[PDB]
mmCIF file of C-alpha atoms in Angstrom:
data_model
loop_
_atom_site.group_PDB
_atom_site.id
_atom_site.type_symbol
_atom_site.label_atom_id
_atom_site.label_comp_id
_atom_site.label_asym_id
_atom_site.label_seq_id
_atom_site.Cartn_x
_atom_site.Cartn_y
_atom_site.Cartn_z
ATOM 1 C CA UNK O 1 0.000 0.000 0.000
ATOM 2 C CA UNK O 2 1.738 3.061 1.434
ATOM 3 C CA UNK O 3 5.231 2.201 0.209
ATOM 4 C CA UNK O 4 4.151 2.485 -3.429
ATOM 5 C CA UNK O 5 4.455 6.221 -2.968
ATOM 6 C CA UNK O 6 8.251 5.818 -2.968
ATOM 7 C CA UNK O 7 8.579 5.137 -6.657
ATOM 8 C CA UNK O 8 5.943 7.652 -7.617
ATOM 9 C CA UNK O 9 7.644 10.493 -5.748
ATOM 10 C CA UNK O 10 11.098 9.465 -6.913
ATOM 11 C CA UNK O 11 10.013 9.636 -10.548
ATOM 12 C CA UNK O 12 7.983 12.863 -10.204
ATOM 13 C CA UNK O 13 11.004 14.477 -8.465
ATOM 14 C CA UNK O 14 13.279 13.556 -11.368
ATOM 15 C CA UNK O 15 10.822 15.113 -13.801
ATOM 16 C CA UNK O 16 10.550 18.280 -11.705
ATOM 17 C CA UNK O 17 14.326 18.521 -11.356
ATOM 18 C CA UNK O 18 14.629 18.413 -15.143
ATOM 19 C CA UNK O 19 11.835 20.958 -15.618
ATOM 20 C CA UNK O 20 13.718 23.377 -13.296
ATOM 21 C CA UNK O 21 16.768 23.215 -15.610
ATOM 22 C CA UNK O 22 14.640 23.902 -18.731
ATOM 23 C CA UNK O 23 12.858 26.865 -16.992
ATOM 24 C CA UNK O 24 16.198 28.254 -15.741
ATOM 25 C CA UNK O 25 17.422 28.387 -19.311
ATOM 26 C CA UNK O 26 14.124 29.881 -20.631
ATOM 27 C CA UNK O 27 14.190 32.593 -17.955
ATOM 28 C CA UNK O 28 17.873 33.316 -18.644
ATOM 29 C CA UNK O 29 17.180 33.600 -22.380
ATOM 30 C CA UNK O 30 14.462 36.193 -21.622
ATOM 31 C CA UNK O 31 16.896 38.096 -19.372
ATOM 32 C CA UNK O 32 19.438 38.278 -22.220
ATOM 33 C CA UNK O 33 16.706 39.766 -24.414
ATOM 34 C CA UNK O 34 15.758 42.341 -21.819
ATOM 35 C CA UNK O 35 19.420 43.396 -21.557
ATOM 36 C CA UNK O 36 19.644 43.653 -25.366
ATOM 37 C CA UNK O 37 16.493 45.762 -25.556
ATOM 38 C CA UNK O 38 17.604 47.973 -22.617
ATOM 39 C CA UNK O 39 20.868 48.664 -24.429
ATOM 40 C CA UNK O 40 19.114 49.509 -27.620
ATOM 41 C CA UNK O 41 16.888 51.968 -25.759
ATOM 42 C CA UNK O 42 19.970 53.435 -24.036
ATOM 43 C CA UNK O 43 21.930 53.899 -27.252
ATOM 44 C CA UNK O 44 18.881 55.651 -28.732
ATOM 45 C CA UNK O 45 18.450 58.089 -25.826
ATOM 46 C CA UNK O 46 15.286 56.497 -24.438
ATOM 47 C CA UNK O 47 16.468 54.907 -21.239
ATOM 48 C CA UNK O 48 16.618 58.168 -19.372
ATOM 49 C CA UNK D 1 11.973 2.986 7.555
ATOM 50 C CA UNK D 2 9.700 3.667 4.557
ATOM 51 C CA UNK D 3 7.552 6.315 6.325
ATOM 52 C CA UNK D 4 10.565 8.560 6.940
ATOM 53 C CA UNK D 5 11.828 7.976 3.373
ATOM 54 C CA UNK D 6 8.454 9.039 2.085
ATOM 55 C CA UNK D 7 8.354 12.148 4.241
ATOM 56 C CA UNK D 8 11.707 13.180 2.864
ATOM 57 C CA UNK D 9 10.669 12.538 -0.726
ATOM 58 C CA UNK D 10 7.584 14.754 -0.152
ATOM 59 C CA UNK D 11 9.629 17.583 1.251
ATOM 60 C CA UNK D 12 11.952 17.426 -1.764
ATOM 61 C CA UNK D 13 8.880 17.338 -3.953
ATOM 62 C CA UNK D 14 7.340 20.444 -2.542
ATOM 63 C CA UNK D 15 10.771 22.237 -2.719
ATOM 64 C CA UNK D 16 11.001 21.395 -6.423
ATOM 65 C CA UNK D 17 7.314 22.267 -7.150
ATOM 66 C CA UNK D 18 7.827 25.637 -5.388
ATOM 67 C CA UNK D 19 10.891 26.441 -7.460
ATOM 68 C CA UNK D 20 8.949 25.595 -10.664
ATOM 69 C CA UNK D 21 6.128 27.919 -9.598
ATOM 70 C CA UNK D 22 8.610 30.603 -8.990
ATOM 71 C CA UNK D 23 10.390 30.214 -12.329
ATOM 72 C CA UNK D 24 7.027 30.120 -14.161
ATOM 73 C CA UNK D 25 6.098 33.406 -12.492
ATOM 74 C CA UNK D 26 9.556 34.882 -13.200
ATOM 75 C CA UNK D 27 9.536 33.831 -16.852
ATOM 76 C CA UNK D 28 6.103 35.386 -17.315
ATOM 77 C CA UNK D 29 7.122 38.652 -15.721
ATOM 78 C CA UNK D 30 10.103 38.773 -18.070
ATOM 79 C CA UNK D 31 7.932 38.198 -21.121
ATOM 80 C CA UNK D 32 5.760 41.118 -19.996
ATOM 81 C CA UNK D 33 8.936 43.227 -19.530
ATOM 82 C CA UNK D 34 9.985 42.267 -23.142
ATOM 83 C CA UNK D 35 6.523 43.342 -24.406
ATOM 84 C CA UNK D 36 6.766 46.689 -22.689
ATOM 85 C CA UNK D 37 10.300 47.304 -24.090
ATOM 86 C CA UNK D 38 9.234 46.255 -27.585
ATOM 87 C CA UNK D 39 6.297 48.647 -27.444
ATOM 88 C CA UNK D 40 8.659 51.457 -26.484
ATOM 89 C CA UNK D 41 10.938 50.618 -29.391
ATOM 90 C CA UNK D 42 7.946 50.543 -31.768
ATOM 91 C CA UNK D 43 6.786 53.980 -30.611
ATOM 92 C CA UNK D 44 10.203 55.529 -31.215
ATOM 93 C CA UNK D 45 10.524 54.217 -34.777
ATOM 94 C CA UNK D 46 13.027 51.506 -33.932
ATOM 95 C CA UNK D 47 10.946 48.498 -34.954
ATOM 96 C CA UNK D 48 10.279 49.578 -38.619
#
């Protein structure tokens, strides 16, 4: 009964650990874009 | 025994699920930041 949770949680945790690495890269990619756009605004006089 | 192993797996689980929620919120806020920057660029003639 109860012990069957062990494999379920082990496998879910592996999936979640992988998902964290894919979201870290996606978030980082968006940060690089924000920096690029900020610079473009700054070079054009529009970032204060 | 197995009860304690399960408790530990659940704690890891919630730690991972909480980090995913956070990165989903962070990613979304960055996409909104990208939208706002793009709209500024568009208004100042920098996006064609």
